[PDB]
């Protein structure tokens, strides 16, 4: 109790506890985003689009999870890529409960193609299966989803030849970029069963300035503001 070693131990415990509170406050000032999507769905294009001029504010390659730090308008973002984790999803998907939002990337030009696992499985039907699975987990009831529709210009070039009816048999209408993009967007947002709790923000990836990072910013601030209105009782 009053021994010198006891006092030294208590002081060390106090020093450690102060550092741990300082670390917890610093860490609380970040916005954590989970990045999902199919394998060749343009995830790397998005990752690069975020880290253009502002990044990071004998090690071994991790290969499990990829970290991406970027700041935009006085807001620091953490984005986690788990595309290289080829295992059972439900074993580790609960570790990401509490993220601000989920970024899902779909390649619009994937409808003609099929997966290499089996020919009778369209790449976009697997995309909807993944979207339905992640959107309706018990852990992600209140997590909003940012949806990116990648490769618009290759999608456009294709639909002059191949119709969208090969992906959606029940579809019937003219063939042009606007009416196909709208139909696919309405198809992916119909998979939302938690309409009252969560919202889907859809965008078409452009290659102009940082309009993609502006979209993420404007969607994350909307999420935060709506959370604070619900806490206050006004939403």
């Amino acid at each position: 109790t009053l021994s010198a070693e006891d006092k030294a131990a208590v002081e060390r415990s106090k020093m450690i506890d102060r550092n741990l509170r300082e670390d917890g406050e610093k860490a609380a000032r970040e916005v954590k985003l989970l990045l999902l999507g199919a394998g060749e769905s343009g995830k790397n294009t998005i990752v690069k689009q975020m880290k253009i001029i502002h990044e990071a504010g004998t090690r071994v390659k991790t290969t499990g999870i990829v970290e991406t730090h970027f700041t935009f308008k006085d807001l620091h973002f953490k984005m986690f890529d788990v595309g290289a984790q080829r295992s059972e999803r439900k074993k580790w998907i609960h570790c990401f409960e509490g993220v601000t939002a989920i970024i899902f990337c779909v390649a619009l030009s994937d409808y003609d193609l099929v997966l290499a696992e089996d020919e009778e499985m369209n790449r976009m039907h697997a995309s909807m299966k993944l979207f339905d699975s992640i959107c309706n987990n018990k852990w992600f009831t209140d997590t909003s989803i940012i949806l990116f529709l990648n490769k618009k210009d290759l999608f456009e070039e294709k639909i002059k030849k191949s119709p969208l009816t090969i992906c959606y048999p029940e579809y019937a209408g003219s063939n042009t970029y606007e009416e196909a993009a709208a139909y696919i967007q309405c198809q992916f947002e119909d998979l939302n069963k938690r309409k009252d709790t969560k919202e889907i923000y859809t965008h078409f990836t452009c290659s102009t300035d940082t309009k993609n990072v502006q979209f993420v910013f404007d969607a994350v601030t909307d999420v935060i503001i709506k959370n604070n209105l619900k806490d206050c009782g006004l939403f």
């Binding site: 000032r29 308008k73 006085d74 009252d196 935060i224 206050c232 006004l234 939403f235």
Partner: protein, 288 residues
Amino acid sequence: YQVITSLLLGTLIFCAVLGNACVVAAIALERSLQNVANYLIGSLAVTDLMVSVLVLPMAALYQVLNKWTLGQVTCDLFIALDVLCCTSSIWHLCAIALDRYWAITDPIDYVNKRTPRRAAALISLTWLIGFLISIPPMLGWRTPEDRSDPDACTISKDHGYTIYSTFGAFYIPLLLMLVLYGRIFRAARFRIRKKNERNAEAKRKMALARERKTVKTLGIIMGTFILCWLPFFIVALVLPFCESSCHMPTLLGAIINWLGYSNSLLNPVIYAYFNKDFQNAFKKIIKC
């Protein structure tokens, strides 16, 4: 007669001290309820508890006996403590409205620069304003009419002091709250407003439902703050300035007084007993 009034005012004090201790206790021992917002609500409960144990019992006695029987010195203390703890209560309602405002309208500050030191500074400023309003009458700003009648524990009712302690305690607090919650209402309404047809219809119904939730909430907060303290602070500004033929019916005096003090009973109900985070933590502690 006096049996009736002593038990009606007696239950009011009991329900008040019970309601406020429960809120502080929930905060004290629940780790979930340890956020900047619930610190400011918890401090209102402390202040409102301090009113219900210190002022309200000593005031109920002056009502049922119709005389002051504690001497001139105790009464100076009663008046000072009445103008200290109750002013601090009305400025706690503005600290909460400024915190809510800075969160709806400033996400960057919310994420980056918002810490419990904010709540500590706000509570300290509230109590400082309370002291700055309640101390002047002790060191000056006092009329001999207060001490003229031993069977009376009224306030200085100096004209300049009336303006000071009536504008700095209600009328300036009121303006601030009407501006902040109007801005909050406009910001809310924006965020709300901004087969496919069924989806459209569903969204239209959800928007209207959320526009009825926000209007109901704002109407409750302000229409409980107004209907508690406004009747009192109108009379307390008029009577001293308009002396001639302005007889206050004794009955009306007491109803108005104890309608004001009922704000310390209704504040826990609206700020604590409605938000689920508290309501569910009460379930938890009740079940061992």
